[PDB]
Amino acid sequence: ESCDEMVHADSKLVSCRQGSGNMKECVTTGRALLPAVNPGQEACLHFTAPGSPDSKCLKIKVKRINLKCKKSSSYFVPDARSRCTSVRRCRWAGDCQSGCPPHSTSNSFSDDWAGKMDRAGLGFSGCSDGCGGAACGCFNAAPSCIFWRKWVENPHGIIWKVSPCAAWVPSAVIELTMPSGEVRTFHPMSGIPTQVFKGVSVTYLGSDMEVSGLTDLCEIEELKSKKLALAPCNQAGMGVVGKVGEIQCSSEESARTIKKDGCIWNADLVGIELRVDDAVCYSKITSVEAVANYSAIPTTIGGLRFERSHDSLGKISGSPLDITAIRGSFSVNYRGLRLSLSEITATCTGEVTNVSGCYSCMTGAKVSIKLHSSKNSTAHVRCKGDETAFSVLEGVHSYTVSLSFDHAVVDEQCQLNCGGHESQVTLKGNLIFLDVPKFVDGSYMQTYHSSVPTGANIPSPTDWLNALFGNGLSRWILGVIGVLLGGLALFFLIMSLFKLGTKQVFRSR
Amino acid sequence: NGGVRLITLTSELKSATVCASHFCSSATSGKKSTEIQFHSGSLVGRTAIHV
Numbered sequence: 001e002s003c004d005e006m007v008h009a010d011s012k013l014v015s016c017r018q019g020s021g022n023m024k025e026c027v028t029t030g031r032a033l034l035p036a037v038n039p040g041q042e043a044c045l046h047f048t049a050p051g052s053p054d055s056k057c058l059k060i061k062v063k064r065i066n067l068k069c070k071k072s073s074s075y076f077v078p079d080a081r082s083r084c085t086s087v088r089r090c091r092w093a094g095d096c097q098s099g100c101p102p103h104s105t106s107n108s109f110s111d112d113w114a115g116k117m118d119r120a121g122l123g124f125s126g127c128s129d130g131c132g133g134a135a136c137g138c139f140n141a142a143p144s145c146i147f148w149r150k151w152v153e154n155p156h157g158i159i160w161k162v163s164p165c166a167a168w169v170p171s172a173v174i175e176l177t178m179p180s181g182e183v184r185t186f187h188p189m190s191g192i193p194t195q196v197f198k199g200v201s202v203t204y205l206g207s208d209m210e211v212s213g214l215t216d217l218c219e220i221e222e223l224k225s226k227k228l229a230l231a232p233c234n235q236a237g238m239g240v241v242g243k244v245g246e247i248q249c250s251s252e253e254s255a256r257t258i259k260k261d262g263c264i265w266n267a268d269l270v271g272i273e274l275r276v277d278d279a280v281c282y283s284k285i286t287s288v289e290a291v292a293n294y295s296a297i298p299t300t301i302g303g304l305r306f307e308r309s310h311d312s313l314g315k316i317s318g319s320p321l322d323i324t325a326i327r328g329s330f331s332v333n334y335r336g337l338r339l340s341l342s343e344i345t346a347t348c349t350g351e352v353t354n355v356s357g358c359y360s361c362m363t364g365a366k367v368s369i370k371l372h373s374s375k376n377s378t379a380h381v382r383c384k385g386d387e388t389a390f391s392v393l394e395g396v397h398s399y400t401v402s403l404s405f406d407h408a409v410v411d412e413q414c415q416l417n418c419g420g421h422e423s424q425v426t427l428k429g430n431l432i433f434l435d436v437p438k439f440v441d442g443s444y445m446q447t448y449h450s451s452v453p454t455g456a457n458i459p460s461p462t463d464w465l466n467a468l469f470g471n472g473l474s475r476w477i478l479g480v481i482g483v484l485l486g487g488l489a490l491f492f493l494i495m496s497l498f499k500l501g502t503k504q505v506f507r508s509r
Numbered sequence: 510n511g512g513v514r515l516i517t518l519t520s521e522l523k524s525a526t527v528c529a530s531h532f533c534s535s536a537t538s539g540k541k542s543t544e545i546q547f548h549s550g551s552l553v554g555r556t557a558i559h560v
């Protein structure tokens with residue numbers, strides 16, 4: 001589409017050579033600054049070489065500006081169950097004389113338990129006491145050593161992905177297109193590196209907007225059913241029992257099993273109770289839908305409407321009513337890149353075909369320009385009021401670009417130049433005015449709003465009284481006279497009607 | 510006249526987001542033919558819908 005907000009910060013800053021024989025470049029290094037633009041615009045970065053007449057540009061595309069948060073930590077908490085078993089034995093020797101553990105023996109495995117498995121998981125080797133007698137299992141009055149072992153299992157295999165965060169910094173998406181032809185996408189943050197690719201390090205800056213009731217919120221998501229929910233989650237490994245933050249593990253691929261060496265649990269997560277050689281275990285682990293302040297995919301806490309934006313590396317978003325933020329400018333840095341220049345530009349001349357659009361408003365006024373040349377793309381339009389750069393193709397084609405005008409009747413003379421050749425163009429058409437749209441029921445904001453032009457807010461006497469009188473440099477007086485005569489005639493008629501009405505009201509009471 | 514309409518033939522619509530020139534919206538009901546509107550007179554001119 002169109003382009004605006006040119007910079008030209010580091011023109012004529014090359015130290016190249018003959019360039020592979022005919023014309024090439026080596027590297028370009030500098031620094032520029034891109035101002036804030038509306039969502040759905042393009043910011044071009046036009047370079048200028050001292051030898052070559054013109055060069056290519058670098059377009060920056062922004063689609064949505066969502067309110068996401070950072071990533072403090074990452075972990076997976078699998079679902080657990082209640083499993084336990086016991087065994088009944090007799091003393092019959094000096095191993096269970098008085099107590100089961102002499103001083104520190106915690107290995108409650110008498111070469112018979114099933115703890116040496118890969119599906120067992122985490123547990124605690126405990127022990128208890130028993131009774132004596134024929135009904136208790138022995139034939140000698142003595143405390144019987146009865147061992148018990150409990151653990152947790154996961155029959156289904158549901159895996160959750162929790163990511164605590166307490167920053168909620170503004171962010172947006174950037175669809176960057178390199179001048180060579182490669183087009184890639186990435187999600188920059190507010191002050192966070194954006195994984196610089198081929199030297200380009202374009203970053204986004206915000207305004208540090210405060211939050212109303214966002215203190216302890218997380219972005220726990222589900223993997224199988226892809227279900228999202230907003231609920232306060234736990235912190236890193238050092239945690240407390242009573243809320244979310246149950247038995248975790250290393251990663252997702254290691255979350256299917258609850259085995260040790262990666263799974264972390266502090267203490268007191270499963271209870272044990274026994275009366276007579278039973279050792280039954282009860283469940284105390286709560287599911288995700290058990291703590292307070294558990295929201296769902298649609299969340300309208302406060303002025304923010306947290307929706308589920310389909311996007312990679314993040315599924316949490318939200319957009320209040322029109323905010324009109326202060327500034328959202330960018331910062332671009334270069335380290336190294338290669339670009340080719342033709343420097344073989346020939347005669348090129350274009351003209352204007354159509355013109356339409358709004359007044360100085362959001363979408364602007366789009367003007368169609370037709371060109372004809374042999375070079376692929378060598379053009380740079382420069383005029384007063386606004387500057388717009390675009391790319392063309394080989395041969396004769398049609399292109400549509402948008403410019404910013406500050407006059408109702410656009411009748412001026414701009415200068416157009418493609419590569420090294422220059423010419424003159426003219427624009428003539430009628431435009432209209434569109435203000436900020438109003439809010440309607442059933443519609444909710446999705447990403448954000450940038451800004452709306454509401455500066456003048458005053459009627460212009462030049463554009464006004466246009467269709468009232470008429471056209472013409474001398475027909476205006478005739479139109480004014482005719483309108484005045486008609487107004488006087490209608491005023492006399494209305495006065496006569498009012499006099500007749502008053503006369504009818506006075507008499508015949 | 511009111512806005513854009515999304516048509517689904519494979520299955521129902523769970524959730525989707527639409528994009529316009531200078532505005533965006535998001536709505537979901539769970540039917541086949543769902544309607545999504547941005548505002549009153551917000552789309553005036555030549556724009557491209559990216560859902």
Ligand SMILES: *[C@@H]1O[C@H](CO)[C@@H](O)[C@H](O)[C@H]1NC(C)=O
Binds near residue numbers: 292
């Ligand atoms: C839920 O949110 C309310 C209001 O923010 C707060 O007072 C309450 O302590 C929260 N509950 C929990 C368990 O944190």
Ligand SMILES: *[C@@H]1O[C@H](CO)[C@@H](O)[C@H](O)[C@H]1NC(C)=O
Binds near residue numbers: 353354368398
């Ligand atoms: C220019 O003429 C009209 C004016 O709006 C427009 O509809 C038409 O598509 C334009 N011509 C071409 C060839 O696109």
Ligand SMILES: *[C@@H]1O[C@H](CO)[C@@H](O)[C@H](O)[C@H]1NC(C)=O
Binds near residue numbers: 376394
């Ligand atoms: C111009 O474009 C055509 C087709 O897109 C391509 O084959 C050709 O290599 C291009 N020329 C240059 C100098 O990039």
